[PDB]
Amino acid sequence: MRGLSRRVQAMKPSATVAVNAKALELRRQGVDLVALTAGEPDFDTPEHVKEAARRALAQGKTKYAPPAGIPELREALAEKFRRENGLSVTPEETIVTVGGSQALFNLFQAILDPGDEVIVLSPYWVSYPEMVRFAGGVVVEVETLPEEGFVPDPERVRRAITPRTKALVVNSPNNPTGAVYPKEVLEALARLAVEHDFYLVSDEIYEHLLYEGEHFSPGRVAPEHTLTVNGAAKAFAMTGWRIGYACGPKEVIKAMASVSRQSTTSPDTIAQWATLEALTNQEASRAFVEMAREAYRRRRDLLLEGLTALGLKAVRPSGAFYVLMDTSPIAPDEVRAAERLLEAGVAVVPGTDFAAFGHVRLSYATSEENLRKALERFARVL
Amino acid sequence: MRGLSRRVQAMKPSATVAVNAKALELRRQGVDLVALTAGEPDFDTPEHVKEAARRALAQGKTKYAPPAGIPELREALAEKFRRENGLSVTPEETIVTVGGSQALFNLFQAILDPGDEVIVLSPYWVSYPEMVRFAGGVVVEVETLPEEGFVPDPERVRRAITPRTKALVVNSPNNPTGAVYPKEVLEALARLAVEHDFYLVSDEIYEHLLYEGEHFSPGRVAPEHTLTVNGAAKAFAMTGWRIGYACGPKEVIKAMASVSRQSTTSPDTIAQWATLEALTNQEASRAFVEMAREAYRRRRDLLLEGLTALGLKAVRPSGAFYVLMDTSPIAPDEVRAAERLLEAGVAVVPGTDFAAFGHVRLSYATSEENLRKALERFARVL
Ligand SMILES: Cc1ncc(COP(=O)(O)O)c(CN[C@@H](CC(=O)O)C(=O)O)c1O
Ligand SMILES: Cc1ncc(COP(=O)(O)O)c(CN[C@@H](CC(=O)O)C(=O)O)c1O
C-alpha cells in the first residue's frame, strides 16, 4: 500500500528556519523588518578559502571522494584536533561529513536503538531531540538554570542516568544560551560517561567564537566514550559549503562512515579541498577568526548595554552569537512576545523549541546599525 | 549504554572490498594495472558549469539554502522534467538532494516502516538493498535474465507482490547491465504499481548516456505512484559536486525535505548554482552531452568486438557505461575470476554484490588506449 512512515510523521517543525522563511515573505514584500534570527555569520568566507576552491576547480578535482573524506583532509583534521584541542587522534579516527548536522545524524543512527535514552540539557538546539527521535531513541531532558549562568550541574545529570542511557549530549559554546562550560564541568560530565558507561557527544562547532574563558574538550578525559563534533561553518563562515567533521573511537567513526556511503556517498569534493586551506593556512585563517570575534564582541557588548537599559533580562554570553532574552516585560509567553515584537518590526526566534519558555533568541550576526534599530523598536513595544 | 545500533551491526560486508584490498597491494607493489572499474565519467566538468561556480563564489553565495534546494533550481528542475521527460511536475513537486544517493535514502526513510517490502530487480546497484534494510524494510529480489537481455518480466514481478509491498525500484538505463527498458515493459511495471497500490521508484541518473533506444519515464503513466530520481553526476560529469534531484507527489517530496533538514540541512550552495547553469544553458550542456555520448559509443563497440573476438560473452549495453562479462572461461566464480584478472594486470568489479553471479562488471569510462590494453591482457589469461 502507499503512505508515509511513522518515523517521518512524528516529526515536528523547526522555528529556527520557520522564522527566517516568514521574515522574507513579508520583507520581500516590503516592510522594514529587522532580523535577529539566523544561525550563520554575516561574514562571507575568507578569500584564501575561495581561491583554494578555484584551484581545485581548475585542477579538475571534481571526482568521487571516499565516504570518510579525502585522505589529505583527514590528516589535517587529526592535526587540528591534536594542536587546537589536544585530542590524541589518528586520521582513521576522523571523518568528514556534510556539515556538523550530518556528523550528529549519522552518529545517532550508528549508536541508537529504539528505546535508548539520550540525555539532552535544556535549553538545547532544536535538532538534537528530533535527530534522536528519528533514530528510535527517547529524549531525557535535564534543565540548566538562568541563575546558574545556564551551566549544568553534573549532579542533576547523574540523576537522569538510568540503565537505558546510551548517550549524553553536551554543546559548548552553546546555542541558544551562549554559555561557555568550564573545564571542571566538562571534566565531571566525562567521568560520568566513563563510570556509567555511555557515550558523551560533544558539539563544539562554536569553538572559535569565544570571548571570555577557554574552550575545553572533554575528549581529553574520556577518548573511548567521546565523539567530538565540529565544523568549518561557524569559524570560517562556510555554512553553505556543507562541511563538518568529527572524531572519536575507531569503531564508531567507521560505523558513521558506513551510513555516509549509504546516504551521501561522501561530501562535495570542492568544499573539502577548500576546507583543507582553512585548516592549513593558519596565519590567514587566524586573522579571519580574530576579525570576526572582535566584531562579535562589539555587537554583544552593545546589545547587552541596551537590553539592560530597557529593563530586559538576559544572561551574558561568552560564546556563539546568540542571546536568550527574558520576554517577561513584553508578554506573558515567549510565543506571544515574538508576535508583539514582529508587529513592532523585529524578527526573533521563540524559545519554545529550545525548551526555553518565557525566552526568545536574538542573534548578533548582523551589523551594529540593525542592532540599534532593534533596540529602538524594543523601546517602542516597551 | 554503549555499542553500535542493530541496523549498523546488521549490514552485509562487501566482496568488492576483498578484491579492491588485493588490487592496491599490487598497486603499492608498483604493478601497472588498468582499471575497468570506473563508476564515473572520465571527462571533467564542462567550463560553463565551472564558470558558474566561480561566479557564485564571487557573488558570495556561501550561506544556507532551503532544505529542498534553492528556488531557482526547483523551477529549472520543474522545466527539465516537463520538457525532457514528459513529467508535469511543479517546483513544489521537485527536490535537490546531496547526490542521487541521498534522494534514494531520504525516500526509503520517508516511506518504509519496519517490515515493509521493497521489490528489487537483479542485477541491482549495490546500494538499493542496503538502503531498504537500513529503514527496517525487507528486500524482495526478482531476477532479470541474461538470456532475456536483462529486461524484467512483469509476470515474474507480479508474483512477488504481497500485501506488505511498499515500493518497487526500476533502474533504466541500468547499472550494471547497461540495458534500457522498452516503453512497453516500463508501462507494465507502472500498471502494477497503480493496481496493487504501491510506490514506483525510478532511477534515471543514466538518462543521457543512451546509445540505442528511447528513454521513457513511467511517471508519465502513473504520476501519483511514481517518484523519479535523477542527477547531474553522470550527465554533466559532476560526481564530486554531489547534486541529485527528484520529483513525485508533493506528500512524499515534502517528507523527504523533512529528512534533509534534520541531517544535511541542504546541499552545498555553490554546487547548486553550477547545476542551475548546466540546466538552463541548453546550448552548452547539450554539446557536452552529445560529445561525451559519442565517446562512450565508440569505446563501447571497441570493447564489445574484442570480447566476442576473444570468445568472452557479455550482453551488449544500450545505456550507461558498464558491461557484464560472463567469467566462466576465466575462473570458477566472479570473485576468483576477478583475482585471476588482477594478476594479469586488470582491475574489474565482481558482480557478487550486484547479485550478478558468474559475472563481472566492466566500465568503459576510460581512454581507448586502456581499452586495447585491457583487451590484450584478457587474451593472456585465455
Ligand atoms: C549547536 C549547533 N550544532 C550544529 C549546527 C549545524 O551546523 P552545520 O550543519 O551547518 O555544520 C548548528 C547550526 N545552525 C543555526 C541555524 C540552524 O537552524 O541550523 C542555529 O542553530 O540557529 C548549531 O547551532
Ligand atoms: C543506478 C544508480 N543510481 C544512483 C547512483 C548514485 O548516483 P550519485 O550519487 O552519483 O549521483 C548510481 C551511481 N554511481 C556508481 C558509484 C557510486 O558508488 O556512487 C556506482 O553505482 O557504481 C547508480 O548506478
Short mmCIF file of C-alpha atoms and ligand atoms in Angstrom, two decimals, chain A residues 64 261 265, chain B residues 39 99-101 125 128 171 175 203 205-206 233-234 242 322 361, ligand 2:
data_model
loop_
_atom_site.label_atom_id
_atom_site.label_comp_id
_atom_site.label_asym_id
_atom_site.label_seq_id
_atom_site.Cartn_x
_atom_site.Cartn_y
_atom_site.Cartn_z
CA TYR A 64 34.07 10.99 -6.25
CA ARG A 261 28.27 5.62 1.89
CA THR A 265 28.39 8.74 -0.51
CA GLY B 39 31.74 4.27 -11.86
CA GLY B 99 23.55 13.31 -4.89
CA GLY B 100 21.10 10.81 -6.32
CA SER B 101 22.15 8.65 -3.35
CA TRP B 125 23.10 -1.46 -7.91
CA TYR B 128 19.50 -0.39 -3.16
CA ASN B 171 16.59 1.47 -12.99
CA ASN B 175 23.76 -0.38 -13.57
CA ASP B 203 16.25 5.77 -11.03
CA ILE B 205 20.56 9.01 -13.48
CA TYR B 206 21.92 7.41 -16.67
CA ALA B 233 26.51 13.19 -11.72
CA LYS B 234 26.68 11.22 -14.95
CA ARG B 242 27.25 15.88 -5.10
CA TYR B 322 29.01 -0.69 -17.99
CA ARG B 361 31.39 -5.59 -14.27
C1 LIG C 2 21.59 3.26 -10.80
C2 LIG C 2 22.35 4.25 -9.95
N1 LIG C 2 21.65 5.17 -9.24
C3 LIG C 2 22.26 6.05 -8.47
C4 LIG C 2 23.61 6.11 -8.44
C5 LIG C 2 24.27 7.10 -7.49
O1 LIG C 2 24.36 8.39 -8.02
P1 LIG C 2 25.18 9.64 -7.46
O2 LIG C 2 25.41 9.63 -6.06
O3 LIG C 2 26.49 9.71 -8.08
O4 LIG C 2 24.66 10.71 -8.23
C6 LIG C 2 24.40 5.15 -9.15
C7 LIG C 2 25.87 5.73 -9.13
N2 LIG C 2 27.36 5.50 -9.12
C8 LIG C 2 28.41 4.49 -9.00
C9 LIG C 2 29.46 4.89 -7.97
C10 LIG C 2 28.87 5.17 -6.60
O5 LIG C 2 29.12 4.38 -5.65
O6 LIG C 2 28.19 6.21 -6.43
C11 LIG C 2 28.04 3.08 -8.93
O7 LIG C 2 26.83 2.78 -8.78
O8 LIG C 2 28.93 2.18 -9.05
C12 LIG C 2 23.75 4.29 -9.93
O9 LIG C 2 24.40 3.47 -10.68
#
